[PDB]
Design a protein around this ligand. Structure first.
Ligand SMILES: OC[C@H]1O[C@@H]2O[C@H]3[C@H](O)[C@@H](O)[C@@H](O[C@H]4[C@H](O)[C@@H](O)[C@@H](O[C@H]5[C@H](O)[C@@H](O)[C@@H](O[C@H]6[C@H](O)[C@@H](O)[C@@H](O[C@H]7[C@H](O)[C@@H](O)[C@@H](O[C@H]8[C@H](O)[C@@H](O)[C@@H](O[C@H]1[C@H](O)[C@H]2O)O[C@@H]8CO)O[C@@H]7CO)O[C@@H]6CO)O[C@@H]5CO)O[C@@H]4CO)O[C@@H]3CO
Ligand SMILES: OC[C@H]1O[C@@H]2O[C@H]3[C@H](O)[C@@H](O)[C@@H](O[C@H]4[C@H](O)[C@@H](O)[C@@H](O[C@H]5[C@H](O)[C@@H](O)[C@@H](O[C@H]6[C@H](O)[C@@H](O)[C@@H](O[C@H]7[C@H](O)[C@@H](O)[C@@H](O[C@H]8[C@H](O)[C@@H](O)[C@@H](O[C@H]1[C@H](O)[C@H]2O)O[C@@H]8CO)O[C@@H]7CO)O[C@@H]6CO)O[C@@H]5CO)O[C@@H]4CO)O[C@@H]3CO
Ligand code: HEM
Ligand code: HEM
Ligand SMILES: Clc1ccc(CO[C@@H](Cn2ccnc2)c2ccc(Cl)cc2Cl)cc1
Ligand SMILES: Clc1ccc(CO[C@@H](Cn2ccnc2)c2ccc(Cl)cc2Cl)cc1
Lengths: 445, 445
């Protein structure tokens, strides 16, 4: 019995909070060099054990939630935002159920409907960018995705009510996943704490009556909202209007931030690699034809390069940069015993660019998958949607949304860096944001 | 007319204070990769232009003090500590004559006195270390250097006044070389500013009566103190008591911090490379005789390996990490004009470890000089003592001190790392200080 290498720190309480805050990826890779796949360090009077590489990460992915707990760590931030009796508020077994329900709502039939829906929103949104210029993609994209994710995941009724004042109510809920909300106790009245709660009431308010306007009209609609309203536990019990509104919040935020960032990033990887951009456009005409008809689900599958570009964006810029659990009981990896109390973490970012396995690691090269790579050679080197019990459910949908949008976009414009500036990464927010994401765009010929 | 490349910061007043603060070598090397030999950034209101590599740094080394000015940057820190009328308190031509007088004292005849003085001091000091154990070398060495430096640079009388309190006064003096003291204005009543001012007045006092005593008694002693007392500007004017006492302070602070740090790291480099350490010990027998008699100045020139070990230590661990100047008139390098007002900088650390010029840059290898290297091959790739109007005058004395000390130390002990630990660098204060610099030692065979 031996516990992980511990990284001592001179600072009394902060610990590594400043160095890790600067560049977490730099911090963690160096730590990998000095100490290996398994190490501990303290930050803000908290101890963290990291697991790097596929083998060590296996601990986290394979374990049972009674052993590595996700509520113990996520709940602080989630419950105030999403709502009571949903996500990390309920026992895991109850949550597995809520997932199985949502998952059902993400099936080919619904995606088929989504493609055109998304393609419309994209075309219409960009009517105000005209023929050329230099604008903020990340800003645009997150505005559009809030629109597309809404139409798809919240149905027509709710989407038609998305104005500026609702956009703000969501933006107030973004300010819940913060530095301060994780450490400080929920009785210190920071401005954000207050707004996060205000918007939660105001938005559940909107969902409350929008639910029932569908709970009534006999107009048979087959969408995500419908699925939820019709679904049922092993109990037989249906979801209360509270539960339903709850998981509507989860759906919008999860499905909105993770796609915007990714989409936004791919824009720059594509504008930087101009030939790779043109082969993406060429692939569009090959798979869809010169006339370029509207898009259908069936065409997406044959957009292989585009798929590998998305797979490559997610490799280098995974929206979920870290994943965490509380050790409720002692766990063993690489001969080390992690003591109950440590917060265990894995970083897809580190794993997916690790030197031992990713050849030309910092290169944006979608052709890497047409070779030998750890994404197939190994179980947990490529993990942008996680693995095991806490596995993502949105991957199908996320690919649908990003695929359609970028297809449509490559059809509308050609994109270039401004003076050859490729955005750097900001860590001020959990949200993996690109520095100064303004892009040059001219009409496609 | 092109100004240097500018690295932007989002953080408003601070700038890069934290990124640079935590790892300046990393920050600067990274910068060098992205931006080139010349670039600029701002920190705490101030703007810096760094000149990395032999060619960029040539601008600073060659420049006149009218154009690139030392006083403007150094004087706030310096004058309260060394005193008025000396170093940066006076016009540069005045200071050059003082450098000249200080040089005249650092000659072969005095060095021959220093050798046996240092040897005896070292043997006496380490008696308390005993046959083996685990002590903090950096403390030991700094304690010791203070005794050897005084003995050589102040003389026998002043040395015999060196008790705990006087040592404590000198430490209050260094407190003046603070992060804080360069930034915040001098009219603030911080604890350290008071400490410094008080201890300045008390050392000056000790030096006053000491100067007057030697000025009196007719015993003819030929040391450095007397060189100063017998010295004279082109004026024909002798030094006022306050001028002598001033440079005597500057002499000990200079001759102390720089040697102690260098000897500390050398210690750890030789503890890591045991086979190198052994070769150094053998050299002592080969050069000085198997009998190992008392060290002489002539023997010092012959310890070539020990020589290159010091040189190699200075390469990786120069105690003056950065040289700085204020731009008064506009200056051009690599096609860029540094606007007046910028603080122009060179890092020896960075120049001495630069990828494109050093084979195995991070490697402690004293033999690298027996091949082809930038020390001999470029002009300014190797500059631990600087170059130009502001060149160091203390190099020879510094080698004498560090040779004699390490010669005697090797004869006394075999040194080792504790549990494989090599001290990492502590940058908080600008001096390369070793983290937890405790060494294992045992009696030499
Ligand atoms: O020896 C070099 C070491 O010295 C410096 O550390 C000082 C530091 O500045 C201060 O923070 C303070 O430390 C106090 C500390 O803050 C408190 O957390 C506590 O420490 C206890 C730990 O909480 C507890 O974990 C346990 O520690 C044991 C470890 O759990 C166990 O893993 C093992 O540790 C070994 C590591 O596994 C291994 O990696 C290696 O450690 C290297 C470090 O990673 C590296 O950072 C460095 O450490 C420096 C440090 O930078 C200095 O600031 O070098 C190490 C290379 O050897 O080796 C570790 C064992 O040496 O064993 C430890 C116990 O030995 O108990 C500790 C207390 O022992 O209280 C601390 C009060 O001292 O002071 C330290 C001491 O100099
Ligand atoms: O892509 C640009 C940039 O976007 C972000 O920057 C924002 C920043 O966070 C805010 O602080 C603010 O900027 C204010 C700034 O802080 C003030 O100093 C001032 O800026 C003026 C300068 O003081 C002045 O020097 C001059 O700048 C000219 C330079 O002198 C000249 O050398 C050249 O600069 C180019 C460099 O030579 C070249 O290396 C390259 O620099 C890269 C940066 O290092 C990199 O960080 C990135 O910057 C992002 C940044 O990360 C965001 O935070 O861009 C470069 C990569 O190519 O490029 C430089 C530009 O070509 O030219 C400039 C003139 O443009 O003028 C500026 C006034 O613009 O005022 C600012 C008040 O807004 O806002 C910015 C918003 O972008
Ligand atoms: C590119 C897009 C996305 C990426 C990269 C992504 C990533 C992830 C990751 C890494 C996890 C695991 C977290 C952990 O184990 O702690 C996860 C889980 C999850 N995701 Fe996503 N996600 C994306 C989009 C979505 C979408 C669109 C939805 C909803 C439709 C969604 C809903 C969920 C849910 C319900 C979980 C499970 C939480 C649990 O069981 O603890 N995600 N996702
Ligand atoms: C390990 C030993 C030493 C090293 C590495 C070292 C390094 C340096 C450097 C880099 C400079 C140039 C500063 C600049 O250009 O901004 C300098 C200058 C100087 N040093 Fe040293 N030094 C050492 C020892 C000494 C000693 C022992 C003395 C006293 C005998 C001394 C006295 C001086 C003086 C008077 C200057 C000139 C200041 C000026 O003209 O601006 N140094 N030294
Ligand atoms: Cl309906 C729903 C229910 C639960 C989640 C958990 O979402 C993830 C983020 N995420 C985004 C997309 N897929 C995952 C998450 C949220 C908050 C925290 Cl503190 C930690 C994590 Cl890992 C998401 C949607
Ligand atoms: Cl008598 C005497 C007079 C002047 C100096 C110059 O001292 C250097 C450090 N140093 C130490 C040994 N050789 C140089 C220095 C002093 C102050 C500042 Cl703010 C910055 C620097 Cl780089 C040294 C001795």
């Amino acid at each position: 019995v031996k516990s992980p290498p511990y990284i001592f720190s001179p600072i009394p309480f902060l610990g590594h909070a400043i160095a890790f805050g600067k560049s977490p990826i730099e911090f963690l890779e160096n730590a990998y060099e000095k100490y290996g796949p398994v190490f501990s360090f303290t930050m803000v009077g908290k101890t963290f054990t990291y697991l790097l590489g596929s083998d060590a990460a296996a601990l986290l992915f394979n374990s049972k939630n009674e052993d590595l707990n996700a509520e113990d760590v996520y709940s602080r931030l989630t419950t105030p935002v999403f709502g009571k009796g949903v996500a990390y508020d309920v026992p895991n077994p109850v949550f597995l159920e809520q997932k199985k329900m949502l998952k059902s709502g993400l099936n080919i039939a619904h995606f088929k409907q989504h493609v055109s829906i998304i393609e419309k929103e994209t075309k219409e949104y960009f009517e105000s960018w005209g023929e050329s210029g230099e604008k903020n993609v990340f800003e645009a994209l997150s505005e559009l995705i809030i629109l597309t994710a809404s139409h798809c995941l919240h149905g027509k009724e709710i989407r038609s009510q998305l104005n500026e004042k609702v956009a703000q109510l969501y933006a107030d809920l973004d300010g819940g996943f913060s530095h301060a909300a994780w450490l400080l106790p929920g009785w210190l009245p920071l401005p954000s704490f207050r707004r996060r709660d205000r918007a939660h009431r105001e938005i559940k308010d909107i969902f409350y009556k929008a639910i029932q306007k569908r709970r009534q009209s006999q107009e048979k609609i087959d969408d995500i909202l419908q699925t939820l309203l019709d679904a049922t536990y092993k109990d037989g019990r249906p979801l209360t209007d509270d539960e339903v509104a709850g998981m509507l919040i989860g759906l919008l935020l999860a499905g909105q931030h993770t796609s915007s960032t990714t989409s936004a990033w791919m824009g720059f990887f594509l504008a930087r690699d101009k030939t790779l951009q043109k082969k993406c456009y060429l692939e569009q005409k090959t798979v869809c034809g010169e006339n370029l008809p509207p898009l259908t689900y069936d065409q997406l599958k044959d957009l292989n390069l585009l798929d590998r570009c998305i797979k490559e964006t997610l490799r280098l810029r995974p929206p979920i940069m870290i994943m965490m659990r509380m050790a409720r009981t002692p766990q063993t990896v690489a001969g080390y015993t992690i003591p109950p109390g440590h917060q265990v973490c894995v970083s897809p970012t580190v794993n997916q660019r690790l030197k031992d396995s990713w050849v030309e690691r910092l290169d944006f090269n979608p052709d890497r998958y047409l070779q030998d790579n750890p994404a197939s050679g190994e179980k947990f080197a490529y993990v942008p949607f996680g693995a095991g019990r806490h596995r993502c459910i949105g991957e199908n949908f996320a690919y649908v949304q990003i695929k359609t949008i970028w297809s449509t976009m490559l059809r509308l414009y050609e994109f270039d860096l401004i003076d050859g500036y490729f955005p750097t990464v900001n860590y001020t927010t959990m949200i993996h944001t690109p520095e100064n994401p303004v892009i040059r765009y001219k009409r496609r010929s």
